[PDB]
């Protein structure tokens, strides 16, 4: 499942880099590198322009431990519950994932960041694989925003 592997590598690297402040590639490295750079520009913009909403959403989720981190899967599924899929929703979910990741670092729950990245990746790849393939994967992601 290369689409899962590539997606996890991009999403995990972004969440962990956002949480730790320290920038840390396999197959399709050139595309994945542009996707991660696109994610830095667009995702940092999303978190800044919607910071107040994200703060309230984070407080509502009330994440105090690793057990509270097993509820986000149902939240991520809710993003696409109306049947609509687009890159804006996808990048917004990953940006909010990075926002949670920063929170998890602050409360010394850094070990939860990887299961969070695996859960975001699973929802995208498991429930939207057809759409992601039709949109040409992360090449299409990079092209859609064309920063």
């Amino acid at each position: 499942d290369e689409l899962y592997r590539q997606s996890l590598e991009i999403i995990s690297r972004y969440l962990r880099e956002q949480a730790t402040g320290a920038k840390d590639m396999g197959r399709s490295g050139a595309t994945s590198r542009k996707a991660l750079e696109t994610l830095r520009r667009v995702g940092d913009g999303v978190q800044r322009n919607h910071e107040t909403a994200f703060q309230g959403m984070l407080r509502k989720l009330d994440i105090k431990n690793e057990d509270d981190v097993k509820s986000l899967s149902r939240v991520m599924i809710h993003v696409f519950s109306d049947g609509v899929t687009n890159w804006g929703r996808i990048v917004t979910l990953i940006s909010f994932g990075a926002f949670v990741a920063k929170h998890l670092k602050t409360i010394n729950q850094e070990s939860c960041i990887e299961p969070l990245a695996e859960s975001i990746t699973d929802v995208l790849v498991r429930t939207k694989r057809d759409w992601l393939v039709k949109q040409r994967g992360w090449d299409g992601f990079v092209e859609f925003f064309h920063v």
């Binding site: 667009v42 509502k60 989720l61 993003v79 929703r89 917004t92 909010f96």
Partner: peptide
């Protein structure tokens, strides 16, 4: 509530990049 609020924000982001 949270996933719906993310969907709304994401649609605004999508419109911003998609509009011709």
């Amino acid at each position: 509530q949270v996933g719906r609020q993310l969907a709304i924000i994401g649609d605004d982001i999508n419109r911003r990049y998609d509009s011709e």
